[PDB]
Design a protein. Structure first.
Lengths: 242, 242, 242, 242, 242, 242, 66, 66
């Protein structure tokens, strides 16, 4: 039946090896496209077409979300997220006042050499202090000087590694959307588009800009199923025949 | 007569071997274009053009609709829609509360393993249970813990399959529109454009965006009729001579 | 004299073989352009230009109209328009009610097997009956079910055929515009641009969009005259010298 | 001195063969540009540039006017305007009423066959009657039937012919513009950019569109002078020293 | 130190051969850019990047001013401005009334043939009259016929010549701008960017359009110093340490 | 966990050889991107995709700041800032009034020849006066007429040099951003994208335009780590598990 | 084949080239490549006719003389 | 021909190459094609001078020493 589609899709990804299931229900774009190669075989007196050679049917997918998820990076890289891993990150503490006896005391737990910045913009790299007390030179600051310290600390959290020779697995994807009724103006059916053998594409981009909410985007390439030789299945199951 | 056209076309497609007929009366664009290859033959002292070699008269068609219809994808793929087919789709259930004995009861009909999601985005893939009771570990959730279950269910509906080796048949297309009278401002005639041997083009794209009504689009390539060697026929039958 | 041009041109095409004359006076654009090939000879100590080789003067024309005219398509195709030809077109009938005895009666005169559409987009192809009464199965509709019928009818009108091996003949084009007098703001003269040997170009496009008035457009290529070796003649005739 | 230029240039062209002089003072754009070819000679260890090779100094000009002149087309084509020449142009008469005896009387002086157009856009090509009375068939029109006649007439005016193998000769061009004084806001000098030896360029385009005032444009290519080997002489002559 | 730059730069050019110094303090854009060529050397199993080859470090400069200087054109051409040179330019005067005895008296100092223009755009090229009285033919004008005369006069001014085989020598360039303080909102420092060996680029363009103030633009290519192998030097000098 | 990112990233760079640490906390853009090379291996009857070859995983970075830092230019060039260096720059003095005895006295400390500019843009280069008194010729200026002097002075400050055969060395970059909770609208975690082994790209551009604040931009290319073969490490440590 | 008329762009005549005694040449090649449409090719060697001693006859027959 | 100066970018010298006893070679070709400007070409064979036994002399004359 001729129906109206005015919404986006809810997307489900599944991994073929172990069945790891991811889903997104706050998408902003879900699209797929098909392209083939055509050529004309000609001859005779007139240069008139005699045959058409068609081959290389190819299908691509693109999904663009509204929130951020590390699992999307996982699918793109074909890696795994290690939970509760210890990591070493940078930290900044600014506003330390040099005392009368040119001693500065840190309020954090450094792991590497501390670097101090004076108001003019010069650097001084000292090693870690046991009591966290540093004898700053008089040529750097004298008294009532606000200085800044940049040191590495230790943190625990999730971790994902992007290796130089690790690629992606094969997945099974499905979009779901709804189709309305032009006459009655009420939901008529549910439309499911299923791809049974896809490969995540290795090209992605992440761009952080001030005042802009990040919308990550992922791409896939659809391949023919190993036995049924399908590439995609479109289903328009209705809401009264279930 | 010099007339004014200010509307789009109603489109009719007919399959050759079978005779299956599809019509669209809510179109948004119907266009056709012609291209031709030209070359000049030069010579003599002045190096002046002497002859023009012309060949390769090619015609293309494009139709863009306002509603969605699966038969358009059927024409593009050269396949058939199988009514009332059983299919496996995904479903989501929100708000399951883990009870005192750490047990969650499902109100659906899963077919595969049920995957559970806690509020911190962690997964637990339990196999299907008979009664529909699942013992969620204490390390996963506690009393009054909303969870999520993603399971596969069964539905029935129309199914269309896209394969890697099946292509399109040959069709017969016709546009119909109306032409007005500049002097009297009333409908003067009906204009019919008939293509008797076309081939659907395998290139298409379907993009679902939030808040945007989908307008599907299809393309064809026109070929010369095998008997009459016609590529298209334009008719401007009047509304007084019928 | 230095004059002002602020208008389009009335165009007068005319075939050479027979003298068939077509004229348009509601044009929207009339343009012509000239191109030429240049090259430089170099040599000596310094690599200085020593000669400019000029050749291949070419002229093209473009006309864009405000009304639709089948004779323009005839001119592009170099083909004639047959008058009062019998043609077989499509027609649609909506709202046929299935009676108590599942009989549907058509009000038209089908010339091929009718196709019926129910409210759920299902088709039923039945050969044309004598009285125009058809027995719709109860599995299709029972009673008070609006149905749609698509059948072919016969009409009388003009007909133009586009063939795969038919090309255009030669014409003689001429524009005409008026030039104003900057000092006195009155029509000073008439400007005629005459091309005596042109060839219509087969590239054309017809796009029908809802809410948009069609503006057809045609192109020509100008060639040198056989004897006088002219390509175009510009004439400015004053309105006092006649 | 540092001055402000905020105007266009009055342009003067002069033919070298005979001294024929054309000027335009209602110009709209006057520009000239210089291009040159450079390359680097490298070598040794490190692949560092050891030399720069420069050659091919070229200069181009462009002038765009506000009025229309046949003289500019004459410069581009290197032809001559043969004033007061007899020409054969088209004309059209609307409203000829066919009288009772089916006769139409023309009020013009045809030279070729008259073509009649009826209300439905059908043609009738009659030869030239002496008295100017034509017998229109009953199958074409009846009493009180406004018809239209298209015929060729004779006029006199200036004729410019564009040829397939005729090119342009050399010229001498000069711009003129004024410069202001940023301190006193008064004219300080006059800039006279002079090109001793240029060549008109064959590229040309005329486009007539409804409601648009035509602005013709011409392009030149500057060449080195025969003896002094100059290509342009920028002069800034003050108006308090002449 | 982290500062804010929100202005252009005063620009200074100095010639190497003789030390001629030019400066611009009303600039509108001063920019420089660096480009380099990079390649990857790969090999082994896995095709991994094993080395990076980088070379051809190149630097370019661009300056755009707000006033007009002939010295900029001299700099680009590598030539010299010759002060107080006699030149022959065009002049024109409107409204010469032809008297009763068809004599027109010029009020200028012609050097070449005087060309007369009537109100109908026709020319008459008369030689130079000793007294300055010209006998205009009665077939050209009559009593009270305002005419136009175009003739060449003599003036004195600065002359710059552009030749086909002369290029630019080497220069030394410097930009100067100021850098503010984010905290105190006061000027903090002066930024000097010095290029010690540049070559002016021969590409330039000068376009004069009505109502548009001309902004000339010049480009340079920076080259390594012959002994220090420096391409540019950036100096950030404070206003308290001088 | 599905989170919202709406901010930029604080960026930290560290030099590998000596540990010199730079940071920016007023950034405007921090992005990284991944690219990969894919190819399809086909064969057999049907020309079907039989294998996919993937290699050349490449990662790039781009940072765009809001303030100016000479250290960024040093990082791109792989050079060092030699603070407190003596430099020779240009200076300008306006309003020098020529006295009765055509003597002009400077108020600065010239190092090289002083160049004088009169009101008509004429130059006069004189050597350095011991006392600072110059005898301006009466042919240049007479009295109560203001002149301009351009001379070189000496200053002290930082100095970064750019050479033709010095490139950048390897660094270690890290971003930091915060993520929000869609339900509670509170900060949930911190994201630390870490690149262990990058290479600065020697392609920058500085453009100073009037009334436009400058935002410098730097680029990097990430390389695989020598032992772990990682290219980047996305970390999403939380703010309640820490 | 057909020959066109440069002045009027209409088929002027038909051109027939007849060889009355040829011998097929045994050299031939058949190459099957994926994605490539095969175009077979054959060669002949022309010999003089036994009696008339002709080797080939070129005929141009106009479309108005039949 | 002329020879430049890598340092000063100005013309430095004139290079003269002198052959005192040559024989023009009889091989030549002249081809006229539409749209192609003809560039004729000639060849010689250099022979030893009858008394000095020189086949060629290369002279590099400066523009300041003449």
């Amino acid at each position: 039946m001729k129906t109206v589609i005015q919404d986006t899709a809810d997307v489900y990804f599944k991994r073929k090896s172990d069945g790891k299931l991811v889903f997104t229900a706050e998408a902003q774009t879900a699209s797929f496209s098909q392209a083939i190669s055509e050529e004309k075989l000609r001859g005779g007196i007139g240069n008139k077409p005699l045959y058409i050679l068609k081959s290389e049917k190819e299908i691509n997918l693109t999904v663009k979300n509204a929130f951020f998820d590390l699992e999307w990076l996982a699918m793109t890289q074909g890696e795994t997220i290690q939970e509760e891993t210890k990591v070493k990150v940078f930290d900044r503490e600014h506003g330390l006042i040099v005392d009368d006896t040119n001693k500065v005391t840190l309020k954090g737990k450094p792991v590497s050499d501390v670097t101090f910045y004076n108001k003019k913009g010069l650097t001084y790299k000292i090693a870690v202090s046991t009591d966290g007390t540093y004898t700053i030179p008089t040529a750097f600051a004298a008294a009532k000087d606000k200085l800044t310290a940049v040191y590495q600390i230790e943190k625990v959290g999730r971790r994902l590694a992007i290796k130089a020779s690790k690629f992606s697995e094969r997945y099974e994807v499905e979009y779901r959307t709804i189709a309305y009724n032009p006459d009655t103006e009420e939901v008529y059916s549910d439309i499911y588009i299923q791809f049974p053998n896809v490969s995540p594409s290795g090209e992605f981009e992440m761009s952080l800009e001030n005042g802009n909410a990040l919308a990550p985007e992922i791409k896939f390439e659809a391949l023919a199923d190993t036995d049924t030789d399908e590439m995609a299945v479109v289903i328009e199951a209705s809401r009264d025949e279930n």
